[PDB]
Amino acid sequence: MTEYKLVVVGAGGVGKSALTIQLIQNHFVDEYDPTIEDSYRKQVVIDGETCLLDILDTAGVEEYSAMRDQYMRTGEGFLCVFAINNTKSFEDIHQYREQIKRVKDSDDVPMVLVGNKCDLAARTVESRQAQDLARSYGIPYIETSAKTRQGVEDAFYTLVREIRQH
Numbered sequence: 001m002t003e004y005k006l007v008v009v010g011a012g013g014v015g016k017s018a019l020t021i022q023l024i025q026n027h028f029v030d031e032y033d034p035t036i037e038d039s040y041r042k043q044v045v046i047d048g049e050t051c052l053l054d055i056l057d058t059a060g061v062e063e064y065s066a067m068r069d070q071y072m073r074t075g076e077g078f079l080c081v082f083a084i085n086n087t088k089s090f091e092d093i094h095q096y097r098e099q100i101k102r103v104k105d106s107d108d109v110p111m112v113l114v115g116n117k118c119d120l121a122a123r124t125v126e127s128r129q130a131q132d133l134a135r136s137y138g139i140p141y142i143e144t145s146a147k148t149r150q151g152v153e154d155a156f157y158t159l160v161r162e163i164r165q166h
């Protein structure tokens with residue numbers, strides 16, 4: 001049926017893999033195993049439409065992000081993830097937005113800004129600060145927790161709804 005190619009990007013350790021695995025496999029990965037490039041596929045019904053989700057989980061660690069650019073080129077929408085307890089990952093979003101623009105050769109790419117680890121209390125990125133960044137990009141800001149599942153489905157489904165507006 002209809003297929004949506006989603007790509008999850010962001011700094012190392014922000015929770016890209018945990019988010020993807022929680023969405024697809026329904027469990028929380030507690031350990032930290034740096035990702036090279038992994039893909040997941042699953043048939044789901046989103047807003048009444050039966051579709052195929054192809055999610056590319058990318059590397060956030062520089063040393064493991066070799067051919068990242070090439071893997072991303074096929075993506076139709078991107079989840080730009082940072083962790084609410086990692087100010088540097090939030091400041092890093094700028095770099096991922098630029099990479100996406102290069103990979104897609106477009107300044108109009110479906111995207112969603114995601115502030116992950118919202119279950120943690122050492123918050124250094126306030127909601128309003130992220131809402132403002134998202135507003136400047138003209139995209140939605142959603143907070144998530146791969147641990148509790150809060151906002152996880154919302155984040156991924158919202159990205160699909162953004163692709164549909166493209």
Ligand SMILES: Nc1nc2c(ncn2[C@@H]2O[C@H](COP(=O)(O)OP(=O)(O)NP(=O)(O)O)[C@@H](O)[C@H]2O)c(=O)[nH]1
Nearest residue numbers: 012013014015016017018030034035060117145146
């Ligand atoms: N409390 C909490 N921990 C989280 C959350 N998401 C991820 N983590 C934890 O953060 C660590 C890194 O998560 P991981 O998904 O591997 O991050 P990544 O962005 O995929 N890293 P990499 O880019 O190297 O592939 C793990 O110990 C994981 O359990 C969350 O929502 N809440």
Ligand SMILES: [Ca+2]
Nearest residue numbers: 031032033034
């Ligand atoms: Ca391990």
Ligand SMILES: [Mg+2]
Nearest residue numbers: 016017034035
């Ligand atoms: Mg990972």
Ligand SMILES: [Mg+2]
Nearest residue numbers: 087124125126
């Ligand atoms: Mg501050």
